[PDB]
Amino acid sequence: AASGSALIFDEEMSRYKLLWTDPACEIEVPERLTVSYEALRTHGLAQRCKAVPVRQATEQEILLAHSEEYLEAVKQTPGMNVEELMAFSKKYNDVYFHQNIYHCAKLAAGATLQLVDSVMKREVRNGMALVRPPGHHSQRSAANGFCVFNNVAFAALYAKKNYNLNRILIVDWDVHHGQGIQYCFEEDPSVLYFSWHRYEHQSFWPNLPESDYSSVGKGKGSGFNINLPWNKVGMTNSDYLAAFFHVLLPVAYEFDPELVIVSAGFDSAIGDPEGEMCALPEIFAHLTHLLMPLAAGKMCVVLEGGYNLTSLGQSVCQTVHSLLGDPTPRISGLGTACDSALESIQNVRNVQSSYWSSFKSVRTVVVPPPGVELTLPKNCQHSISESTAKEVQRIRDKHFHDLTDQNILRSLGNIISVLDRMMRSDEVCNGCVVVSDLSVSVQCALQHALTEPAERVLVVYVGDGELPVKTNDGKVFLVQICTKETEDKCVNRLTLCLREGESLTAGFMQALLGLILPVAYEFNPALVLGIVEETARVWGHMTCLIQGLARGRMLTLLQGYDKDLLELTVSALSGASISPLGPLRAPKPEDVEMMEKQRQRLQERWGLLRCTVSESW
Numbered sequence: 001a002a003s004g005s006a007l008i009f010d011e012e013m014s015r016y017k018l019l020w021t022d023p024a025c026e027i028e029v030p031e032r033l034t035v036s037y038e039a040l041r042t043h044g045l046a047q048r049c050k051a052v053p054v055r056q057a058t059e060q061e062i063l064l065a066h067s068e069e070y071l072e073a074v075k076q077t078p079g080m081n082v083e084e085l086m087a088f089s090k091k092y093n094d095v096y097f098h099q100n101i102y103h104c105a106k107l108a109a110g111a112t113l114q115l116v117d118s119v120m121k122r123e124v125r126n127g128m129a130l131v132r133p134p135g136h137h138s139q140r141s142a143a144n145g146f147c148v149f150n151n152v153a154f155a156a157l158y159a160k161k162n163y164n165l166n167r168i169l170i171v172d173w174d175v176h177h178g179q180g181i182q183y184c185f186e187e188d189p190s191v192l193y194f195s196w197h198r199y200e201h202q203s204f205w206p207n208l209p210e211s212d213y214s215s216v217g218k219g220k221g222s223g224f225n226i227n228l229p230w231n232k233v234g235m236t237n238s239d240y241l242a243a244f245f246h247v248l249l250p251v252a253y254e255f256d257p258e259l260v261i262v263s264a265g266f267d268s269a270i271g272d273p274e275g276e277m278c279a280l281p282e283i284f285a286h287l288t289h290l291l292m293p294l295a296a297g298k299m300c301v302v303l304e305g306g307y308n309l310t311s312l313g314q315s316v317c318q319t320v321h322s323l324l325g326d327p328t329p330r331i332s333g334l335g336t337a338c339d340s341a342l343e344s345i346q347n348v349r350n351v352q353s354s355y356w357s358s359f360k361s362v363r364t365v366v367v368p369p370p371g372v373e374l375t376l377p378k379n380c381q382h383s384i385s386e387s388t389a390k391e392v393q394r395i396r397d398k399h400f401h402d403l404t405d406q407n408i409l410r411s412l413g414n415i416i417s418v419l420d421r422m423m424r425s426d427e428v429c430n431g432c433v434v435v436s437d438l439s440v441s442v443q444c445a446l447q448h449a450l451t452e453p454a455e456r457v458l459v460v461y462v463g464d465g466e467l468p469v470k471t472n473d474g475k476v477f478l479v480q481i482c483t484k485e486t487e488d489k490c491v492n493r494l495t496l497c498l499r500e501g502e503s504l505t506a507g508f509m510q511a512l513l514g515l516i517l518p519v520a521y522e523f524n525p526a527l528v529l530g531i532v533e534e535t536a537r538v539w540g541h542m543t544c545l546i547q548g549l550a551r552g553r554m555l556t557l558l559q560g561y562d563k564d565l566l567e568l569t570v571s572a573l574s575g576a577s578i579s580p581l582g583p584l585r586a587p588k589p590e591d592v593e594m595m596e597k598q599r600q601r602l603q604e605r606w607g608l609l610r611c612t613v614s615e616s617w
């Protein structure tokens with residue numbers, strides 16, 4: 001399988017700049033590239049990525065998305081002086097030209113195609129290209145918004161032609177609307193374009209009516225263009241995550257893309273002069289991580305905007321951190337989206353209701369049963385202290401007097417050993433332990449974590465019984481996926497009873513993206529505890545996405561030995577790729593009704609669940 005992450009960059013693309021007075025473009029400086037690459041080198045991230053050289057995009061590759069007349073007009077700019085370059089740039093909106101910009105434009109485009117090839121050739125698992133000029137505003141016969149050629153549009157068309165892909169997802173989290181990408185794939189159902197952008201009721205640049213939520217695509221591409229307009233500035237982490245959980249992610253996993261291309265503009269981060277939003281650079285580590293379970297991890301990150309030189313480097317490294325599989329930082333202070341964001345999210349979901357189902361040294365430690373030996377990935381390891389042995393003795397005599405099964409005692413010693421290495425040693429991140437007795441193992445795992453201390457523990461249990469888990473003090477949230485419909489009493493437990501059949505994968509994924517993840521992210525646990533009983537596919541996507549919480553510190557307790565299940569949890573816990581879910585039969589209405597009743601029951605306490613504007617009394 002593929003491994004590593006590509007970092008495509010070249011200092012040549014920082015060798016064009018603005019040569020005349022223009023306050024509209026004076027923020028697009030060469031230092032954007034040099035600051036971002038040097039930030040990756042300072043933090044040791046560039047040295048960890050496979051450096052792929054940039055090449056020039058050929059003429060025929062440029063003609064994939066641009067006209068011959070516009071290409072030949074740009075081709076003449078290297079021969080122009082300052083006066084002629086100023087006159088040529090006046091023919092367009094918010095863009096300047098340079099003697100070298102046509103050279104770097106072909107390099108920025110070629111760098112994107114180099115990144116597409118390395119990912120599609122399985123030479124790397126994912127990658128990022130630091131390019132200038134940007135591209136998502138560029139159109140078929142016009143330069144626009146600092147862009148000359150549409151790099152991301154090139155990547156999708158290049159991937160369609162040379163690899164025969166049928167479904168490509170484009171995620172534009174830049175703060176500006178990439179109308180060039182929208183125009184290019186307006187009638188193409190093979191490319192799904194998502195974009196959030198500062199809109200302010202069309203008053204913000206580029207002031208386009210097509211940037212609104214009602215532009216869903218044209219013809220056979222209807223429903224494959226998703227615009228989410230930000231009508232107020234200061235959007236926070238809660239707004240960005242609500243946009244993912246309730247708009248992008250449900251559509252993305254139903255779309256099931258064969259490749260993910262990200263128009264990664266970081267002017268959506270706090271401190272940027274263009275965006276004026278308030279999301280921290282840490283949010284981009286999660287925006288990346290939440291998309292990695294798609295397309296078997298094949299993700300191509302292309303740089304677009306980002307103009308606060310300090311805010312830029314921080315978010316670039318947070319993106320590469322997630323691409324390399326590093327633990328995601330904890331996000332605190334999460335809550336409901338603001339009213340403006342909730343109105344936007346509500347409107348996009350309604351207009352897309354007719355096109356999509358959901359609307360209207362060691363990273364992992366494994367302890368198999370005694371004697372079972374299995375092949376482990378490179379970053380995983382098998383399992384005992386004398387202090388742990390004494391503590392298991394102390395736990396036994398106080399809480400389990402009539403208990404002598406010396407193999408049950410073995411697992412409890414491993415649970416303490418694994419948890420001690422996860423929280424305190426900082427050398428182990430997560431782990432998986434095969435378990436015989438559930439009630440004693442869950443009790444030991446949960447109680448030992450609270451005194452570690454883990455101030456908050458999220459428990460995700462796939463079973464039917466009741467477990468020794470107290471959820472009455474705010475330190476524990478219980479997520480239970482069961483077979484028997486249980487009346488949920490209190491606002492700190494989430495019980496999902498899915499009506500059995502061939503619709504469980506679709507219903508579970510909708511509950512994962514729409515209920516579990518929004519609640520888990522607001523809860524901000526210090527450790528995740530996964531529990532699966534013997535009587536109890538989709539667990540790989542759950543294990544990977546849930547690692548966005550608690551810095552990826554998850555302990556999974558598997559009851560009984562299933563090598564297939566064991567091998568999948570360990571693979572997902574270790575950071576390996578997750579095989580894509582195929583086409584899923586749309587969820588049963590009885591499950592959607594059940595999931596919406598739980599949202600009504602919990603969204604007043606966990607505002608991140610809200611996908612509507614609350615009714616004021």
Ligand SMILES: NCCCNCCCCCC(=O)NO
Nearest residue numbers: 094145174176205265267305
């Ligand atoms: N604050 C006033 C609005 C001026 N807007 C200038 C357009 C440049 C677009 C660059 C970009 O980041 N594209 O993604």
Ligand SMILES: [K+]
Nearest residue numbers: 172174176196
């Ligand atoms: K955007």
Ligand SMILES: [K+]
Nearest residue numbers: 185191193224
């Ligand atoms: K589209």
Ligand SMILES: [Zn+2]
Nearest residue numbers: 174176265305
């Ligand atoms: Zn931008």
